[PDB]
Structure formats: C-alpha cells, structure tokens
Amino acid sequence: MDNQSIFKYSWETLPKKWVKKMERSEHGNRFDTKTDYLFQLLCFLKLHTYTRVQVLIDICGVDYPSRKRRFEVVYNLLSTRYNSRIRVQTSADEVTRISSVVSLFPSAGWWEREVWDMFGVSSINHPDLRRILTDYGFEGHPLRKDFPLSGYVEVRYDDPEKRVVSEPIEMTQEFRYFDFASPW
Amino acid sequence: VSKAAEFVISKVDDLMNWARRGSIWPMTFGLACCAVEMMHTGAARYDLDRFGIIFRPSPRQSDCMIVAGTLTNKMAPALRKVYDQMPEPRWVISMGSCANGGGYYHYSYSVVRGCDRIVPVDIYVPGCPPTAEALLYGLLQLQKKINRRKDFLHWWTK
Amino acid sequence: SNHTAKWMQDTSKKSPMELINEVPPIKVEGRIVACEGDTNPALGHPIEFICLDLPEPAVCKYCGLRYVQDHH
Amino acid sequence: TKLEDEQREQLAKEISKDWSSVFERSINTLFLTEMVRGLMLTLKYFFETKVTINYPFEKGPLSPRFRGEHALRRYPTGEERCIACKLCEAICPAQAITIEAEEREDGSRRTTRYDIDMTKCIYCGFCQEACPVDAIVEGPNFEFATETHEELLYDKEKLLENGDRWETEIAENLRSESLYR
Amino acid sequence: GHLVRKGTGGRSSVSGIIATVFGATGFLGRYVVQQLAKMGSQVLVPFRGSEDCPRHLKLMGDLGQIVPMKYNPRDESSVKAVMAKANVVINLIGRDYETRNYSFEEVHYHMAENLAKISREHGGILRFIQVSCLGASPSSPSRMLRAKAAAEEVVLRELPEATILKPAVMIGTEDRILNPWAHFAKKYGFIPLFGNGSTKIQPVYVVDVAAALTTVLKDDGTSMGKTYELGGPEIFTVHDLAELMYETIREWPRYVKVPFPIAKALATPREILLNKPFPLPTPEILNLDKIQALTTDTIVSENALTFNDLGIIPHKLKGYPVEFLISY
Amino acid sequence: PARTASQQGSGKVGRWKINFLSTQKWENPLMGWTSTGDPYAHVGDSALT
Amino acid sequence: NFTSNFGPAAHGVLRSVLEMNGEVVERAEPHIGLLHRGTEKLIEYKTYLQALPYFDRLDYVSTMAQEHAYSLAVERLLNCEVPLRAQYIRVLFCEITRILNHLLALTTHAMDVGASTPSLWAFEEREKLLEFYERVSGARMHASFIRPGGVAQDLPLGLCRDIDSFTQQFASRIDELEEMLTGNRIWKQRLVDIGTVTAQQAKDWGFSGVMLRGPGVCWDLRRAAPYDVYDQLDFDVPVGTRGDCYDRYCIRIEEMRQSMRIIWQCPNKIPSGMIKADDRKLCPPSRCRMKLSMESSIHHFELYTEGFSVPAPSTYTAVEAPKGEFGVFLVSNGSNRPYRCKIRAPGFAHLQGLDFMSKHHMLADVVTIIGTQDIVSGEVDR
Amino acid sequence: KPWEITGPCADPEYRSAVPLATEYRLQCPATTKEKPCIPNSLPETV
Amino acid sequence: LRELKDEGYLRCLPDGNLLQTKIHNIGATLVGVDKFGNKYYEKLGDTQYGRHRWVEYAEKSRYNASQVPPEWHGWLHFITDHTGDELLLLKPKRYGVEHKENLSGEGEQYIYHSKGHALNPGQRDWTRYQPWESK
C-alpha cells in the first residue's frame, strides 16, 4: 500500500537475467538476486532516472544453520526522491567472496566490516578491512548460531602477578534456558 | 598511652579526615547512560560542587574514580591504566548496575562482569540508572567511610 | 521446623507458619466461602471457593485461614 | 570557488544599501551590544533565586509508581504472600532471580530459597506486574549504597522479608495504584 | 576430613581449601594469596590496622572468597575468631626493623608461639606453613635471626606436623633492595657496598617462591613435617647484583666503600634513639640486619632440601624477574 | 526430542536437534547457584534447532 | 603528518586517531568498539516483552522513541491495532523525548565549545521532563512504558495541567537560550561554515534526521511515512539552506518549537477512552480482572510465561528518532523469540560522516563536529 | 530592574522558571480527590 | 542559651548545611516530630515547588539519610501528603520491624551476610545430597 509504483516499474524494465525471486508483500518488497550480479543490479539502481535509490540504509546478515547456503545478506535501501524503499536480499555461503558496493554507496565500509566479524561472510573488494565491533583478536564470529552467548574465552581480570590477563570462562550461576514452548 | 597525646592524635586524625572528606575530587569514567544521570547530579538540582567536589579530568590529581556505565573487554586495560596513574589515597564508586556485578549484559560475551574484577571498588551504588539522589547518597556514604579513617594513630602505633 | 529452618535464620520472632496457626478459624455460617481478605484487588489472593463438609477446618491454599461451618 | 566571490559581493551589495545601515551595523559590531545583552541576562540570573535542592535535608520529588529496593509483603495475619509460582523468575529479563520451593510440613507451598542479586537486577518493574498475589513489590527506597558486593546480592529472602519495615509506606502506594493498573 | 576438588580450576571453582594468611598484606603475602585464590580456595586475611591496605587483594578472587577480618595481634580471642574455620594457616609476619613498641624478639618469636598455641587450641587445622628466612640458629648476628631460629624450633615443637620454608632474599616488582638502590642512585651519589663489596647471596624470584608454597601446600601425602630452604637459580655476589641492576636500568655504576666502620657507626644510633618517645624514620639502606647478613655470607646449606626437591628453580634473574626496573 | 509425557500436542515432535552431552556443574559455595565451565553448556538446545 | 590520538564534558567514550599536518586534520578515524554488549545476541536468547528494555537502553538520551520503534515493528509484523488514546499519549511522550534529547545535545555542544550556563539551564529543564517520566511510569530515565500494543499504565490525574505549565515556561526558556547563543559573535565565528555537507554526499553517506535535513533536501519520516496520529498533528518541519554547524543548530531549535506545538496539540484532542488493546492474547489483563475472572488468569499466566507468538515473515520499521532514522529489522519465525533483531541506529552514518567531513579543519573544529553530530556511542555500538 | 531594557526579560509575554508549590503541584500523585475508573473494553465485546 | 546553642545550633558553623536549614527554619513552621526525635517542617507558600518540606534530623553531628522512618519518608519525598502520624496510625500490627538506618559500615555484625558467607554465624552448606557416613 506504499510503493507499488517504483517496484512494479523496476521489475518490468530490469534485465531479467539476474533476478531469482520477487516478493511484493506489504511488509517489504524483496528482490532476491544471485550473488554474481549484485553489483550490476545495484548500479542499475541509483542511476536510472526513475528508480534512483541513492541511499543505502542497512546491510544486515541473517544466519540459517540448516540450509546449504548458510548465510543471507540483506540490503535495505530507500529512494528519497520517489518515497519508496526496497530490500535486495542475496544468498551467501561460507567462504564466498561477495562483491562490494563501497564504490557506489560509500556508506557501506562500516556495515560491511560489521558483517565481516559478526558473521563470517567475506567481501572481495576494499571494505573487508579488519574487524570493527568485536574488540581484538577474536576466536570466532560471534553472531552465528554456534558462538555461545557467553563466549569461549571471556574471563578477563587483573593479575598482580603481572598486570591483567584473559583466561577461559568459568562463570557462576550458569545461563538458565527456559523452554516455554507450547504444543497446541 | 599518654592519654593527652592520644587525645591530640584523635584531634589530628579528625582534622585530616575532615579535610580529605571536604575537598574530595572525583574522576569520571562515563561509559554508559549513568554518565547522563551523573551529569544530572553535577547539574543544578542536586548540586555537587556544594559538597566541595570538582570533576577534575586529569587522573594525576584526582581522588575518587566514579565508574559510571558498563565495562567492556576492550575497555578494561584502559580503565586499569587510568586507575594505576592516581596518587596513593584512592577510592572507587561503582555507579549503575553493570559497573558492579555485570548487571544486564552480565549474561553476554564482550562484557566484564562488574568493574570489581579490574579495580578494587570501594562503594558501589545500586541503580539502573541510580537516581541522582542515590548517587549523591553514595558519595555521602563515601564521606562516612573516609570519616572513620584514623590514620595518624596507625603511624604512631606502627 | 525444617522449611522455616531452611529459609529463616533468626528463630527469635515467630515464623509465618506459627502466626498463621496462631490465628483461629473463622466459623462461617453456610457451606462455601471465598478468601481474599477485605478488598477484591490490592490484596490479591484470587477467588478460592473451598468446601466445608468435613468436621475439621479447611485451609485456603493462599493465606490459610481455616474456615469452619458453624451449625450441623 | 568562483561563485563564492560572486556571492560575497551581492551579500555586501545588499546589506550596504544606505549609509544609516552601514553605520548602524558598524557600531553594532564595534560596541559589543550582543555581548552586553548576554551579560545583562546572566546578571539577572545571578540575582535571581536558585534551585540547589540541598539534598541531605530536603530530598527530591517522587511518584508512587517508583522503583527501588524490593520487598516481600505479607498478609495482615502475618502469613507470607509468596506462593512460588515462578512467574517473577520466568519474566525476569535479566534472570536476576533464583527461587527454589518445597511443600511445607503443614501442607501449603512456600519458598525455600528466594534471592535477587540486586545488581544483576536492573530495576525494570516486571516483578510487581507478574505477581498474582502482589508478593514482591518495589518500595520507594533508593538509599542502599553498601560497601561490599555481597550485600547487593540480597540474601535468601531473609533481607527481602525485612522489606516489611516499609509495609506501611508501600501499602499507601498500592492503594493509590489499585485504581489504574 | 580430606577436602574435595569440586570444579575445573580457574575462578569460581571450590577445590576445598580455606586458608588464613597471617601477614597477607605485603609482598610475599600478596603473591601467595594471589596464587591460592587463583587456584580456587577461600582465604581469610587479617589486617592490623587500616581500611585499605588489604583492599587490593580483595579483587583477586570470586565473591566472598577473600575476606578481610579484623585487628590481628595482641589478643587470643581475636586470633581465635580469625582462625575460626580455617583449613590451613600460612604465617608470614615479620618486619626488618624494630619499632619502640615492638621488637624482633617480640614480633617474630612470640607471635609464632601465639599462632602455634592457638592452632593447638583450634586443632582442626591440616597444614601450618610458616615462612621465616634463609637464617640459621643463633650462630649469626642480627638478633632477628636468632629469635627467628628459636621461633622455627618452637613452632616445630608445638606442631610436629608443620612445614617451615626458609627462602633466600626475594627480588620482585616490589622488593626492598633493588628499589632502594634505584631510588638512591636516581637521587644522589651512587650506591654503597657494605661489608666488603663481594658478599655472596642467592636472590630468588618471588613468583617461584609462591609456586613452591602452593606446591608444598598441596603435596599429596609426601612431606607433612618438613623444614627446608628455597635458594635461587644462581650464586650472585652483591657487586654483580648491583651491576645487573645497573645494566637493566641503563645508567653508570658507582660504588662507595670503607664499609664496616661507617656501617656500624652510622646504623647504631637508630636503635638507641629509638628505644629512647615517638616514632622515628625507617631504615632506608642502613638496616642493621642488612649489615649483618652482608658481613656474613649466607647462600645455601646444600644439605636438607631444595627447589630441586620441590619444583624447578626460578626462570633466571635476568630477563623477566628484573623487567620491573624499566620504570626508570 | 520425543513428545512430552504430560500434554497431548504435536507442535514439538519431529525436530532434529544436537546435544553436547556436557555435564560438569557444581554448587557455588557462596549462595548455591549452579556454576559451570563449559562454553557449550546450553547452546545446543537453546539456539541450534 | 603527525599521528595524534584523542581519548577524551563526558561526551561519550570514543578513540579518535588523527593523521595531522600542522593544525590540519588530514585524516580522522574513530575506533568505536570501546563500548559493546551483544544486544542482538541477547535479544535472540531473549524474547519480545523481555527484550523491550534493550531498546530502552540503546541511545540512552532519547529513551522512548526506541521503544516506540520496536513496538511499531512488532505491531506491523503482528497486525495488532492500538486504540486512539494509546496513540495520542504515545505521540505526546515521543515528542517530550525529542525535546529532552535536543536540550541535552544542544547544550552539551555548547559546553564542548565553551559555554556552561546554557548547559545548566537545559539540565534544569531536563530535570522537569524526567520528573514527568518518573511520575507517569517507572524511573526517571529508561521507563519501559511503550509495550507492543499501546502503553503499560494509564497516566495519572493532573499530568496534563503540569504539561501545560511546562509548555509555557519552556517556550520562555528556549527564547532565553537562543538569545544567549544565537547572535554571539564568538559562537557564530566558531560554528558557521564548519563541516559543510553537500546533499549528494549526504545521501551517499546515508545520513538521516537533522543531518540529512540540514543541507537542503527536505525529508523526514513523520511527513513521508506518517506512522502514527501525526496527520491530525500538523507541524512545520524546518529545513536548512547551507548545511553546516550553524544551520543544524538553528534546525534543532526550530524542532524544539515544533515539538512544543505538538505537545500542546495532544492534550487538546486526547480522546479519553481505553488503552493498549482489546485482546487478552496480545496484551495482559489488568489486576481486577486477573484476580476475579478465570480465563483472565489463564491468559495472564501464559502471556507472562511464554509471551505471544508472532508469525513467520520478516520486516523493517523506521522511526524519526531525535537523531535520525532509527531502524529495526525483525526476522521472527513462529516461536516467541525474535529471530535476528537487527538495529539501525544512525550512529554509523554519522561517524563515517565525521571521517569525511572532518578534513582540512583544526582540532577545535573536530570537537565542534562531534558536537553537531550528537553522537551516542551506546547506540553507535550496541 | 537594571537589565530590563532589551531581551526576553523586557517582554510582556515572558515567563520565569520558578513555579511555586501551590501553582505547580497542589495535588500529590497518590491521594487525589477523585476515583478514576479506566476503561478496558467495549460493551459489544464484553 | 548555651544549652541549645551546643545542642543543635553551634554545629552549623563548621557544618554548613545546618546553617541553610536554620534559615529555612526561621522561615518555617512545624508539622511533625518522629520517635527518632527528628522534626519535619513545611514552609509552604511563595517559596518554590522543590523546597517546602524538609527535615531536621535531631542528630546534629552524624546526621545521615535513611534515618527517616518509612511514613515520613513518603511524606518527605512528596509521594503522598499523608502525615507520618496518620501512616503510623495505620502501622501494620501482628508483625513489623522497627526502623534501622543503612549502617553497612559499622562492623560486619551490625552489617549482615548471606547463608554461605564465612562471616555469617550460620554458614550453610550446599550439596543437594548426603554422604554415606558410616558410624
């Protein structure tokens, strides 16, 4: 009920070679594409003089630890001129160098670094610099469904032996997990 | 004991403690939202300067350290290095509920379960965030602690 | 003796069980009652209709008050 | 930057219309009239009264919907309220409650251990909403600033029971919130 | 009543031990309580008088593991209530200089005797570990050593199942020889050499002495009544130790000489004026016991036991155990 | 995980799930909470479905 | 080129590193991980009604717009309408929160630049508004008051009268503050033409809120996608002509005044009625019903044990927070725990801004740029 | 008063910020003189 | 003269706060006196909103907050303008504990402990089983 116009026009004029799925819901319109043409598709937008997006709002990762293509990268981006927003959602596995968009939207270096360390998805061109959010040399990638909530090695305390140290976790009052589920 | 000299010692300790309690100089560590409330304490309503309290930024001439916020595994070394650089008489006030005892993100990686592990906290405080009244009452509790600080007597008996 | 020993520590003032035994029964008139205290809200203890067809008092399962039928 | 040269000319050709305008603006920027205005406002506030609540003798205003040092109330008969539903423990967003129960000797169910490590208990309020018997509540006391972590790990219901030292005050609040809650 | 390990090491693991550490306020006390609470064990520390002297070791353990208790000495009831529920007792008390209201004899000897007798009273203890010094029987000057040997004997006598460690001089992040020498050099005309200038000692790494203490503490049924010494990794003359300090501080060495007459005639007035009505300064480097233990060589007896019998000797006193000097 | 022996529903059957048979808990001597030291104490049946 | 460090007022914890040249900042770069918590991981290992306080904790100055955004996201994903009184009081408090944030950011900026009296007067006003909070529900800050489907408790009596008193005296106070700063040649020469941003690179670096509205382009979500009652609440939406510090400042003051217009429009139209729901399956029943009826107790029990279950789809929801487009991305599936709730606080955009727009200036101007950006490391890192 | 010549202090539409007790909060939040009965349902539903 | 001057008047000279409260008193009236001896005043009028109800603690040297009982705590924090004497007419019977300020610093025994902390005379044990324990 919001932006059927831009979405319809974008789908009916696109080179239909690189679109794998389209969903015109009312929660948000989705162009699920192939990871090989992502840069091509995004550079089509931001330039075409009707569906010009010109602003990238978010690049978030989603983890599904039950599918062969484990990860799911998602680009939420709006069109300040045409009052519309679309969500281009690509698939991505373990190591598979995904194209960058820092050439088009310079506001992706930080969001691509965040998806580099939180998740483990790579990025072939520039934005895959070192980690950002997590502190320093960090074992895993602490937002997939495997890195436990309390971390592998997280005890970090002072030592008058020398100065300060990081040692494996021996926390007290273990994390209780309640069930609450409901078989109808 | 030379009861007269013990009385003079008691008076000297009283003077020393009164000075040290009435000229206290904190040192803020504003990690998280408690900093905001701490500012509200230093604001006009529950004035702090009235109690002879000046937020001296340089840690080479401060007395207390007010850890207000939430530690982080990335931030612990900086906090410890700041604490070490203070003069001898020191105190630590743990504002908030995660600067002491982990608090909420206690159940999460990349968070130190309470600043007690890094510096020897003196008086903590409760809160989420502590009402400015609660923080000021915490500092007055620190005054009540430093007030029972017979020190010259200890040196006269050591 | 054991529960209050597990939680309480002082053992100088009387434990909750001792007080709720110190309160006597109610001796109501009919056959069915409802325990809350005196207010419907602000005193909790949702409606707990309890039968009274035994020669011994009947507890309330919240704030045991031990209602008892009066006549035969 | 060629336009800036052109813009700076028109902006000067616009305000400098007559001689009165240039003279006024010049002695305006030369006699510090805005400085004087700021100083006069400041001096007014100086002479004016203050706020300075003077804490240890006249504390600040609160509201019966306050949150602070927890407490476990009990019925007027002296009988405890808590019945070990586990609802407070279940809804705790910080998991800062531990509760372990057992059938008592007389028959009723009560709590063998009930503790809230006050720190890990951020003060959110859900406690006093999950309770179906108003057992646990947040009395309007915020002055408890102990010097050792263990205290703020409020003990196995014992100190929590001692929240009844506020039982009058707390009661008042509850009455005023029976209407709209 | 053998204890039980109920964890996996690291903090918040029980492992049973509860230890009362008399003297746990200074150098070896800090290190040993660090080792114990890191291993996982409850510790009770008494402090004579302060509110913040033990405060640091308040953080080296989980909640309620380290407990500072009360005024320690000159009362049987206080010492008893401090040892109310211990499993082991570690004694480290002892200064290096007399103060009018105390005296080497009083403190070392009589407090060791008091601790032994109150342990006999609370005869529920398992290990009494007393650490004294690299000091022999009254066959040496520095009356502290005579009284400390008498204390060694009386604690062995009042507790035949005890362990008395005799470590050599300690060097660590806060010692009383290297820091005084660095202070003296940085301040003014450089260091003196007492006695001769080439007196032999076996300095030892304090972390390794603490590891030896933890080892002998655990020591599953192997040595329950032993009295032995803890040397260092190598023999050091005092001149060579000073040269080590100088090479590590990156400065030029200078030594002062004619040691015995200046030493005696400039360290004797302190004791006289001391026992003469108010406290007097601390013996920075003119300590009488320093003079004595430097005029007599004390290195190793090579006779009873050693690190080699307990655990490997310290790493070396060149790389890390002196690395704390870089502060200059 | 098999159907619960108390209800009669079916929204929780046929759902393959991996458990790390980790059981190394002990009683925190201060209060009595259940400590642990395994990083995989609960993840296997808390997020990995 | 020197390599200076910057680890500092209490304007947050942040580590700037600066490739310098004389007194020119050739390249400034922030290190930001210095306050991280794992809010997303926690939310996942948590729930809906239990995870609301997390959103309360993010961006801890504006402490209610976040809950408003999260509630909008859950409702959109859930199809749970909300009554008119709930909408009206919710907008009222969102605007009070906007005023709070603007006071704090504006006068902390003034302190960074050097003034102090505006800071103290603004903090007195913040005390008044926080008193409004703690009277309505909970503590001064972090009032978990906006649940999915409406509010938690109705507001007391007299609160509207107090709101009006504050409205009048606060118009006067903004006038005082603007007279104190706007026009002072020191402030003007310290602020103007410091950190220009052309709209092209603004939209590129993905700014939002006042920042995006500073230079030119006129676009805020309240007018574009009017989520809540905002239609009936006409307002002004100021826009700056030459994007820089001074124009962002004037934008902030005009936004304060428009928020006052809204805060008065509400207590004149507030339709006294019910709040928060009509189904005791998404919103719990009140105390009298819970303790008298039977099915009310069943629903209260289930709703405070397992919460409500929301269906399979995933959504994005944006709200015009005081800073900018605060975004929430929910990927909920079936069960009552939010699968992968992702935050989109404007802190990232504003820091990359700092990077590019802090070139060829001096260190005082770096401080000024942080001030005008109004950063909260809490939300930039979460 | 000596300032009172220019600025918001010399404007009839100007208000100060020291609200007296009686004029700001004359009814404490707890014991109001009313008895509010908040609605919670519509008759059709109930 | 000198009697009350030493009782609760001359301490103001090195205490400061007591001087401000004495000024507020010369403006004040009286509204209550509580068993701890302390006097609650209310200078209602044209003064202000934040400062018109306050308390003189009647412990001139070591005066500390939380010395106020609960009823007067309410009346003082403005939550409810019910006087301490009325709330004490309410005063739940059949149980109750007299007030005691937050000591927290005057020795552990005036302070308190959990059931596992060594300083507590209780010192429970947490095992959740039993040994065999032959005779």
Ligand SMILES: NC(=O)c1ccc[n+]([C@@H]2O[C@H](COP(=O)([O-])OP(=O)(O)OC[C@H]3O[C@@H](n4cnc5c(N)ncnc54)[C@H](OP(=O)(O)O)[C@@H]3O)[C@@H](O)[C@H]2O)c1
């Ligand atoms: N020189 C050496 O380094 C060296 C070499 C070999 C062996 N040792 C032995 O190692 C042990 C520990 O040495 P150390 O360097 O760590 O010294 P220490 O820290 O000063 O140990 C003595 C402790 O007892 C306290 N104390 C002082 N006078 C006391 C008294 N009258 N009554 C009770 N307690 C008193 C001290 O000061 P507080 O009152 O402030 O607590 C300190 O806490 C000693 O037994 C010493 O003989 C030392």
Ligand code: SF4
């Ligand atoms: S509740 Fe605690 S962790 Fe949260 S913002 Fe406050 S001080 Fe920080």
Ligand code: SF4
């Ligand atoms: S909800 Fe109430 S009675 Fe029920 S278990 Fe909790 S506090 Fe105890």
Ligand code: SF4
């Ligand atoms: S107040 Fe909240 S944080 Fe504390 S235990 Fe109760 S429900 Fe949880």
Ligand SMILES: [Zn+2]
């Ligand atoms: Zn009942």
